[PDB]
From a paper:
Virtually all HCM is caused by mutation of genes necessary for cardiac muscle contraction and at least 80% of familial HCM is caused by mutation of two sarcomeric proteins: MYH7 (ventricular β-cardiac myosin) and MyBPC3 (cardiac myosin-binding protein C). The motor cycle of myosins couples ATP hydrolysis to actin-based force production upon the swing of its distal region called lever arm, including the converter. Although HCM mutations are found in all regions of β-cardiac myosin, clusters of mutations in regions such as the converter are known to be particularly severe. In cardiac filaments, the sequestered state would be a way to regulate the number of active heads available to produce force during contraction.
Residue numbers in the entry:
A (entry chain D): 46 to 199
B (entry chain A): 2 to 405, 410 to 627, 646 to 806
Write the structure that this text describes.
């Protein structure tokens, strides 16, 4: 694939790539599993399916053991950057609106915890708890649309 | 029991389940693309989960864990769990055969016997008395609209009564279904409901006023009287109505009960003298023989044994559910409440006893002759005594009838046939007289303003052997279905006009016209039978030949009998709305003519028993189809002056088993009763229709850009924008004044697209939520 990043930007990706290198040998090689965290730190938001798709469908043991260099990571970052369909603010609010039974503008705490952990690409019980850091109201009662502002600015 | 259900008391769970109970029963995994319906040889349809779709054939795992392979077209979609045990089936996303079957049988399993399907009130026989008909329930249905309470027959009764008062017009409640489906049970409940709630009119005693108590009492006492002479034990039902009935309940000003009148149809005369091995004759015979009123055995000169009487002991003689002794008490009581005199009551009993002795009179061939003569006279002596006739004149008249000065000759078969034909004519004329008599009592001074007509008649059913009687009832049901179809057509046309939808179609009633025209129009099936009856040289073959030469080519609905090894002899086949019926033409000319020995009839006219002479006073000889045509025109004219309401009774199984559903049997009934027919004709229009406001609230997730987020916006324009933007058939919907109109299936797609979008958006919310967790474990690494 054709690379469209400027030479000054290639070094900006190479400097971020080094921060993820946990090796004491400093070979500048990261596991197929930590690959996603690099792309997320680079201001991108890919799905777990898109993560496993660019790696050519890896196995569970390949994500923990198989290593990867910067020359092979770059054509994959080019593929994620070209994706424009990340979902508008309106799309995100509409999805949570389905779970607003009362039609007031607030979804119950326990419901949102269950939705994000069962529907779609499920989030871990710890990933759910860490996301609801800023908590809910006295009854809880989570103001969606305001929660969309929170997760798209963080 | 939820607060909305508190008014219903003990009835509440037999009418609607609690929200808690609903959500818990509805929580199950469901994939809108894997969970389907597949055909079945034994069960008609089964639920299944798809596995693979390789080469035009779908491979799936059914309930009962079996793996099957079926054609892609043969797979049907399930309605989501949201839709389980729904109250009105017109609201379902998918309205196909298994969608209707499963919603009804799932409610039935929960002991909820009433369901709506558009206009129809569907009821499945529970074979168990449920606490849903008490005064507490009557009180909970008063003044409520259909949607304001769960389905029930009391909703039909109360709304018919309310519509009558509000719209100032006549009403009808049309109750059909097979034998043992529940027509009698529901007809009785409807009539009792009106007696409980109708206003009280002018009760001051008229000059020739007969009867005990009130018009409410009398209307209700009409049923045990009619049941003794018109009801019998059959294989399908222990208390089967062998006649059709239309009761018009007249109301004066303000819902004041004024009068009532009953019209009866196609009484099974053949039963008087004949019974199938597993069936009884009319109840009255066994009621008398019970010896509960011993003075009656002495009066009819009869024994207490049904087996001593050849007309009534050919099949069964006793019924599990029937106490004939208690039943005689109730019958005799009904006649007294209805104002019948001692003379009238004793005359009916005497004429019933006379019929019994008639079947016992034996005949023998005269030596070296083909002429019959009496083989004993004792039973003919007992008959003539009761019928107020001369024994010898009766026996002479039977063996040697006078015809157009010429004294004819009769053999043993000819006399046996003629005494049976006479016994059946007396019985039928006495039943018709009794209905006329009951009608005379069901009167008050309160003037007639409106009526509610309750029709209880056998539904369209295809049997192994279908003769003239079947054509008559099938013809009635054709006309009745056309009345339903035209009513639905008018309702739809009124809705599209009001909402300004330029839909154009022929009356759904026109879809049954060709069959009706084949049966009733000049040179049709009835016209040919009537024409062949006028020629004495005619036979069943001359009639069969006429039907073929007149219709086997230019009449589509007419065709050759599709005879198969198993089913008996057929002569032609008819294409009715509910399927194809194979008719056998043997005896139709004789059935239609109903020939009677007119020498014995002249004796009946000159009888010393006033009743007997009254019944034959206006007898004429030289048709059944002509009378049926007249009575049906009269019924239709009455129905077309009313706002109709439709009740569909379904028999769940053939074994009187509570809670058990036989899928093929329930399916056959759905195909024949109008339920599936109503779905078909509505599918021609716009079956699904959503308000602009409600569409915007549910389908904005499909393209939120088309309906931008605002504090004030025009919903018609917004819905117009959203639908136009989607990769959809833009000819599968129309825009109304307050609602969007959809073709069948379009909504099944809009929901598939909605769940595909909601799953994609949650995935993107989760991927964006992963980004803030990644940036928080990076803002901690950097700092
Ligand atoms: N709603 C009902 N509740 C309880 N039992 C019923 C109900 N409907 C019918 N049955 C039972 O089934 C029998 C047959 O019903 P019936 O009304 O006589 O049928 P039909 O008139 O359609 O032949 C009844 O005598 C009764 O035992
Ligand atoms: Mg009955």
């Amino acid at each position: 694939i054709k690379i469209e990043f400027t030479p000054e930007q290639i070094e900006e990706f190479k400097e971020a790539f080094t921060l993820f290198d946990r090796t004491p040998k400093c070979e500048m090689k990261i596991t197929y599993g930590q690959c996603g965290d690099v792309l997320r730190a680079l201001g991108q938001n890919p799905t777990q399916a898109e993560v496993l798709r660019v790696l050519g469908k890896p196995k569970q043991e390949e994500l923990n053991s198989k290593m990867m260099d910067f020359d092979t990571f770059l054509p994959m970052l080019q593929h994620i950057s070209k994706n424009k369909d990340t979902g508008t603010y309106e799309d995100f609010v509409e999805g949570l609106r389905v779970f607003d039974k009362e039609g007031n503008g607030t979804v119950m705490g326990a419901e949102l915890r269950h939705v994000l952990a069962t529907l779609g690409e499920k989030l871990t019980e710890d990933e759910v708890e860490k996301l609801m850091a800023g908590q809910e109201d006295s009854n809880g009662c989570i103001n969606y649309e305001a929660f969309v502002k929170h997760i798209m600015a963080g | 029991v939820d607060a909305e259900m508190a008014a219903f008391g003990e009835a509440a769970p037999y009418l609607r389940k609690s929200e808690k109970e609903r959500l818990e029963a509805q929580t199950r995994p469901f994939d809108l693309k894997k969970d389907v319906f597949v055909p079945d040889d034994k069960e008609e349809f089964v639920k299944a989960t798809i596995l693979s779709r390789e080469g035009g054939k779908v491979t799936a795992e059914t309930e009962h864990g079996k793996t099957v392979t079926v054609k892609e077209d043969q797979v049907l979609q399930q309605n989501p769990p949201k839709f389980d045990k729904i109250e009105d089936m017109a609201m379902l996303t998918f309205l196909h055969e298994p969608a209707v079957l499963y919603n009804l049988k799932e409610r039935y399993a929960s002991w909820m016997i009433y369901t709506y399907s558009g206009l129809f009130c569907v009821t499945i026989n529970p074979y168990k008395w449920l606490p849903v008909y008490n005064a507490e329930v009557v009180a909970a249905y008063r003044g409520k609209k259909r949607s304001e309470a769960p389905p029930h027959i009391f909703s039909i009764s109360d709304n018919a009564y309310q519509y009558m008062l509000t719209d100032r017009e006549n009403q009808s409640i049309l109750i059909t279904g097979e034998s043992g489906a529940g027509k009698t049970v529901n007809t009785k409940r409807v009539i009792q409901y009106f007696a409980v709630i109708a206003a009280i009119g002018d009760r001051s005693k008229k000059e020739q006023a007969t009867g005990k108590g009130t018009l409410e009492d009398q209307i209700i006492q009409a049923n045990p009287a009619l049941e003794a002479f018109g009801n019998a034990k059959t294989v399908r039902n222990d208390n089967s109505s062998r006649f059709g009935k239309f009761i018009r309940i007249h109301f004066g000003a303000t819902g004041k009960l004024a009068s009532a009148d009953i019209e009866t149809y196609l009484l099974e005369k053949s039963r008087v003298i004949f019974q199938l091995k597993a069936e009884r004759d009319y109840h009255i015979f066994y009621q008398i023989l019970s010896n509960k009123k011993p003075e009656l055995l002495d009066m009819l000169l009869i024994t207490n044994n049904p087996y001593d009487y050849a007309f009534i002991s050919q099949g069964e003689t006793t019924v599990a559910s029937i106490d004939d002794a208690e039943e005689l008490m109730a019958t005799d009581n009904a006649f007294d409440v209805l104002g019948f005199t001692t003379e009238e009551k004793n005359s009916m009993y005497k004429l019933t006893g006379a019929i019994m002795h008639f079947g016992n009179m034996k005949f023998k061939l005269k030596q070296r002759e083909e002429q019959a003569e009496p083989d004993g006279t004792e039973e003919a002596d007992k008959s003539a005594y009761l019928m107020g006739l001369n024994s010898a004149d009766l026996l002479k008249g039977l063996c040697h009838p006078r015809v157009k000065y010429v004294t004819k000759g009769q053999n043993v078969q000819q006399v046996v046939y003629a005494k049976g034909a006479l016994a059946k004519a007396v019985y039928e004329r006495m039943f018709n007289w009794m209905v006329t008599r009951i009608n005379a009592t069901l009167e008050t001074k309160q003037p007639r303003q409106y009526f509610i007509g309750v029709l209880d008649i056998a539904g369209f059913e295809i049997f192994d052997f279908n003769s003239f009687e079947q054509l008559c009832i099938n013809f009635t049901n054709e006309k009745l279905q056309q009345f339903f179809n035209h009513h639905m057509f008018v309702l739809e046309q009124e809705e599209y006009k009001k909402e300004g939808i330029e839909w154009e179609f022929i009356d759904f009633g026109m879809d049954l016209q060709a069959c009706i025209d084949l049966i009733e129009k000049p040179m049709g099936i009835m016209s040919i039978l009537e024409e062949e009856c006028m020629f004495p040289k005619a036979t069943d073959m001359t009639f069969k030949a006429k039907l073929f030469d007149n219709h086997l080519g230019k009449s589509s609905n007419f065709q050759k009998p599709r005879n198969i090894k198993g089913k008996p002899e057929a002569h032609f086949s008819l294409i009715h709305y509910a399927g194809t019926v194979d008719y056998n033409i043997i005896g139709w000319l004789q059935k239609n003519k109903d020939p009677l020995n007119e020498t014995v009839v002249d004796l009946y006219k000159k009888s010393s028993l006033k009743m007997l002479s009254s019944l034959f006073a206006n007898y004429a000889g030289f048709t059944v189809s002509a009378l049926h045509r007249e009575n049906l025109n009269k019924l239709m004219t009455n129905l077309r002056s009313t706002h109709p309401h439709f009740v569909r009774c379904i028999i769940p199984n053939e074994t009187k088993s509570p809670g058990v559903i036989d899928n093929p049997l329930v399916m056959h009934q759905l195909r024949c009763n109008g339920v599936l027919e109503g779905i078909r004709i509505c599918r021609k229009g716009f079956p699904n229709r959503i308000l602009y406001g409600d569409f915007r609230q549910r389908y904005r997730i499909l393209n939120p850009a088309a309906i931008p987020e605002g504090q004030f916006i025009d919903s018609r324009k917004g819905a117009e924008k959203l639908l136009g933007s989607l990769d959809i058939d833009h000819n599968q919907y129309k825009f109304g004044h307050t609602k969007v109109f959809f073709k069948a299936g379009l909504l099944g797609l809009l929901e598939e697209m909605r769940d595909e979008r909601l799953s994609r958006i949650i995935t993107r919310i989760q991927a964006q939520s992963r980004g803030v967790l990644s940036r928080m474990e990076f803002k901690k690494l950097l700092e």
